[PDB]
Amino acid sequence: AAHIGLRALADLATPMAVRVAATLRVADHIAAGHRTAAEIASAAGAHADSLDRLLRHLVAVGLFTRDGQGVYGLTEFGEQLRDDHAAGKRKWLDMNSAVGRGDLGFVELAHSIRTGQPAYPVRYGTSFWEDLGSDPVLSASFDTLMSHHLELDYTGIAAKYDWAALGHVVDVGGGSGGLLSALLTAHEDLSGTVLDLQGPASAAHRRFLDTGLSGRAQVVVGSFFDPLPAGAGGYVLSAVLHDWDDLSAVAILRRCAEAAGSGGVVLVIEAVAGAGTGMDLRMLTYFGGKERSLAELGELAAQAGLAVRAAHPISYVSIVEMTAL
Amino acid sequence: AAHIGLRALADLATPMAVRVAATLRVADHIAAGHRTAAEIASAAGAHADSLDRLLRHLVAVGLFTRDGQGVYGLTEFGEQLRDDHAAGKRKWLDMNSAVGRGDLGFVELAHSIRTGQPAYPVRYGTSFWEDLGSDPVLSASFDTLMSHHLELDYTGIAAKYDWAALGHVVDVGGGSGGLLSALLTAHEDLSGTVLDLQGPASAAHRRFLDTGLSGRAQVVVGSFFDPLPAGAGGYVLSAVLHDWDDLSAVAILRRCAEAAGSGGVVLVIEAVAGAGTGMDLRMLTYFGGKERSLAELGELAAQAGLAVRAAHPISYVSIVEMTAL
Numbered sequence: 274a275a276h277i278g279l280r281a282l283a284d285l286a287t288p289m290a291v292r293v294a295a296t297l298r299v300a301d302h303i304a305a306g307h308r309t310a311a312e313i314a315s316a317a318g319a320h321a322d323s324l325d326r327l328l329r330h331l332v333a334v335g336l337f338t339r340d341g342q343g344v345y346g347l348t349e350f351g352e353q354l355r356d357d358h359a360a361g362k363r364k365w366l367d368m369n370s371a372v373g374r375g376d377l378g379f380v381e382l383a384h385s386i387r388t389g390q391p392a393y394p395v396r397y398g399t400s401f402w403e404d405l406g407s408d409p410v411l412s413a414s415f416d417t418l419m420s421h422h423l424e425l426d427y428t429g430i431a432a433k434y435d436w437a438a439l440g441h442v443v444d445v446g447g448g449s450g451g452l453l454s455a456l457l458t459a460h461e462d463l464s465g466t467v468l469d470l471q472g473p474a475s476a477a478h479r480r481f482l483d484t485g486l487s488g489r490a491q492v493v494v495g496s497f498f499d500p501l502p503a504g505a506g507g508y509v510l511s512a513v514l515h516d517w518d519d520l521s522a523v524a525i526l527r528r529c530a531e532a533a534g535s536g537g538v539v540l541v542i543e544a545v546a547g548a549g550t551g552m553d554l555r556m557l558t559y560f561g562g563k564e565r566s567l568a569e570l571g572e573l574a575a576q577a578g579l580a581v582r583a584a585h586p587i588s589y590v591s592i593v594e595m596t597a598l
Numbered sequence: 599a600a601h602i603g604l605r606a607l608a609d610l611a612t613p614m615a616v617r618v619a620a621t622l623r624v625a626d627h628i629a630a631g632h633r634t635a636a637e638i639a640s641a642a643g644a645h646a647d648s649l650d651r652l653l654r655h656l657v658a659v660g661l662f663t664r665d666g667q668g669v670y671g672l673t674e675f676g677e678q679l680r681d682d683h684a685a686g687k688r689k690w691l692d693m694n695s696a697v698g699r700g701d702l703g704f705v706e707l708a709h710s711i712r713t714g715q716p717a718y719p720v721r722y723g724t725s726f727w728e729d730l731g732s733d734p735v736l737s738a739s740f741d742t743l744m745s746h747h748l749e750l751d752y753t754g755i756a757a758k759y760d761w762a763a764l765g766h767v768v769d770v771g772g773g774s775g776g777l778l779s780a781l782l783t784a785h786e787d788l789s790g791t792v793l794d795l796q797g798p799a800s801a802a803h804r805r806f807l808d809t810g811l812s813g814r815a816q817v818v819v820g821s822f823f824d825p826l827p828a829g830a831g832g833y834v835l836s837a838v839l840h841d842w843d844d845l846s847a848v849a850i851l852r853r854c855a856e857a858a859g860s861g862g863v864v865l866v867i868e869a870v871a872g873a874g875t876g877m878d879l880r881m882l883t884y885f886g887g888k889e890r891s892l893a894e895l896g897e898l899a900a901q902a903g904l905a906v907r908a909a910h911p912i913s914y915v916s917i918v919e920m921t922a923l
């Protein structure tokens with residue numbers, strides 16, 4: 274990151290200003306015709322002088338434009354803040370979304386680096402999953418988010434592997450079914466089931482029902498720490514292991530080992546170290562999880578009686594295939 | 599400008615990682631021969647694996663280096679983290695210092711933008727000054743920091759203005775007397791008074807006493823919201839006004855107007871808008887403060903019965919000389 278000055282490199286004013294902008298939808302208000310601080314503030318329900326001061330800072334940062342009359346506009350860059358923008362980044366920074374909220378837990382990083390425990394609880398007084406499990410709205414935003422992460426990192430994962438051969442795929446921690454839906458849409462004789470908590474499971478169900486996939490896709494509300502529906506061709510763990518510490522990760526893999534038996538395949542699909550150090554710190558502060566390497570996944574697999582037998586990179590992530598030892 | 603991608607621009611992991619490193623003294627432990635994650639963690643009292651993950655992130659950021667054997671080293675950049683470094687930036691980021699702690703209040707920026715009220719309270723349950731007023735240690739770090747900001751921005755402020763002609767200057771909110779001490783050292787027949795709260799004032803006193811200046815420099819514990827020692831040639835407000843909202847800033851200027859009467863001069867010394875946006879948002883989040891322009895100061899001065907007569911820029915800061923209307 275060049276040579277800014279340690280103080281500027283540790284600046285919180287700017288990223289927080291962006292996050293607040295995202296949350297106030299300032300960009301969308303600007304496009305809808307509100308351009309002065311007074312108008313924008315009224316539209317967003319913010320303090321005029323304070324909002325104006327925030328905008329002046331973001332103008333400097335390079336997201337907004339401001340003319341002598343006090344009329345603000347967006348820049349090529351500031352366009353990415355619009356809620357309708359193609360990259361859909363605004364929702365990730367919105368302090369109301371699960372991740373826009375979770376990231377503020379970074380303000381407690383010290384506790385994580387000191388104890389190895391997650392920081393999120395220090396800030397919100399409860400674990401991440403517990404927090405979602407009791408706030409359906411919050412949980413829904415998280416589902417939408419993980420759904421978006423799929424379009425972003427798993428484009429065409431359907432062809433990058435022989436899914437059809439599996440016959441039946443169990444998506445352990447499958448969220449709202451975005452991935453399973455994708456697999457089944459590309460392989461018409463394939464069937465599967467999403468195993469997750471109440472929130473995502475019900476969402477997965479709504480999706481399959483509305484999409485005309487209920488004939489091949491089913492959901493099951495359960496904890497992947499307990500026995501899984503057994504006998505399927507393959508068990509998928511998409512963005513799930515890095516959310517857990519080593520001990521819980523093997524517990525999970527262990528359950529997939531058993532469900533898969535001697536004829537099943539366990540497929541860990543996530544950002545393998547090699548997926549930056551930023552995401553790794555997020556896993557640490559959120560759940561005390563971590564981004565792992567193929568070697569590190571190999572170790573976990575060994576403890577669960579599995580072995581890596583393949584690892585296919587597919588854009589941002591990789592599909593590491595494990596089978597009974 | 600400074601484009602990287604919206605989520606990257608709103609990143610909290612890096613600035614927080616830098617702050618945690620500063621707080622843990624990683625740079626200094628390394629210079630002292632501790633180069634592996636295990637050693638540094640042991641010396642700093644951090645979780646080994648976690649500290650290692652923080653360091654890996656920071657070598658990526660560009661502050662550290664790592665050899666294949668797990669030995670960390672600083673970089674031309676990571677040198678700035680050393681406490682003995684010349685720029686003295688580390689203490690500003692230490693989560694234990696007043697400003698390293700206050701900045702974390704930025705996670706509550708939204709509250710400020712929404713209400714115009716300081717964010718610090720939202721995070722720490724009390725105002726900044728109340729916080730220092732009840733924690734002498736915390737308050738001492740702040741004094742040291744403000745003292746360091748004098749060397750950085752006020753270099754040669756003694757010659758940039760005709761202080762000597764003042765005879766006796768009252769430094770309202772003069773902290774630990776660093777400025778007054780520099781003025782009196784450059785002007786032998788000059789005398790002055792530091793008016794501040796117990797903490798800073800006692801430190802100013804200790805300073806004057808120890809540097810052989812008690813003969814010309816005196817301290818007075820008090821609030822600049824109440825009457826001030828009257829009849830001095832000049833009253834200085836150094837980095838004070840931008841710590842308050844309009845109402846308070848005017849109140850403060852009144853007390854100076856009254857004290858200076860028709861023969862004294864009020865000297866507001868701070869970074870006038872046009873330091874920038876970064877400091878402005880910090881003032882907002884710390885105490886609902888505000889960086890002001892020469893025009894805006896002039897407006898305040900008017901309400902206090904004063905008028906701007908001059909404005910000498912000196913490095914980062916400017917000296918706004920005000921006089922009774």
Ligand SMILES: C[S@@+](CC[C@H](N)C(=O)[O-])C[C@H]1O[C@@H](n2cnc3c(N)ncnc32)[C@H](O)[C@@H]1O
Binds near residue numbers: 451
């Ligand atoms: C990274 S998220 C989404 C993963 C999903 N496969 C995807 O890539 O969109 C992790 C998933 O694990 C689910 N989960 C968390 N704890 C669980 C548990 N104990 N049992 C089953 N699912 C759980 C969360 O609800 C979430 O849906």
Ligand SMILES: C[S@@+](CC[C@H](N)C(=O)[O-])C[C@H]1O[C@@H](n2cnc3c(N)ncnc32)[C@H](O)[C@@H]1O
Binds near residue numbers: 745774
């Ligand atoms: C930003 S510091 C500046 C210190 C010094 N003038 C300098 O420039 O380094 C603000 C000063 O205002 C002092 N202060 C805060 N509230 C005060 C009050 N009500 N009455 C007098 N001084 C106060 C603080 O203790 C602190 O010393």
Ligand SMILES: Cc1cccc2c(C(=O)O)c(O)ccc12
Binds near residue numbers: 372
């Ligand atoms: C909390 C959380 C869980 C899983 C994934 C993510 C991702 C992701 O997979 O990209 C994020 O970018 C941010 C937070 C995440």
Ligand SMILES: Cc1cccc2c(C(=O)O)c(O)ccc12
Binds near residue numbers: 747837841880884
């Ligand atoms: C809280 C606070 C009060 C006064 C000044 C500062 C400065 C300064 O004058 O440079 C900072 O950089 C950061 C915080 C400050």
